[PDB]
Design a protein around this ligand. Structure first.
Ligand code: K1S
Length: 119
């Protein structure tokens, strides 16, 4: 019932994601000169370095907020892809499956800890 445990669990998951070759296109903000129209399509850019820095700054209050930002990385990739068969979009689908598989227990444990605190 540790209410704070999610933070280190998210740091460890981000470390695994950074080790994944599939995270390469998502480690830093999208290159705006390589894709000059990016901001015409994407309203809120997001990347894993921004997520890690927000976490390390103490600017996430819960793992749900971190999860919303990570999911935004994947929805931005889906929105920008010209095809569902593209290389970068295909990498995002595998990385999303990996992330969802590992974040599920982090969210469940945090929500359970909060419920115990208010029992
Ligand atoms: C600029 C956005 N990026 C990288 C996240 C791209 C680029 C290309 C070429 N294909 C893509 N398919 C999905 N996202 N995507």
């Amino acid at each position: 019932y540790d209410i704070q445990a999610w933070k280190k669990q998210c740091e460890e998951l981000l470390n695994l994601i950074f080790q994944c070759e599939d995270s390469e296109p998502f480690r830093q903000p999208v290159d705006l000169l390589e894709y000059p129209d990016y901001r015409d399509i994407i309203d809120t850019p997001m990347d894993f370095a921004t997520v890690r820095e927000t976490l390390e700054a103490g600017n996430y209050e819960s793992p749900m907020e971190l999860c919303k930002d990570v999911r935004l990385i994947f929805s931005n990739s889906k929105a920008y892809t010209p095809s569902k068969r593209s290389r970068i979009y295909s990498m995002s689908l595998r990385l999303s499956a990996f992330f969802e598989e590992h974040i599920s227990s982090v969210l469940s444990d945090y929500k359970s800890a909060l419920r115990f605190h208010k029992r």
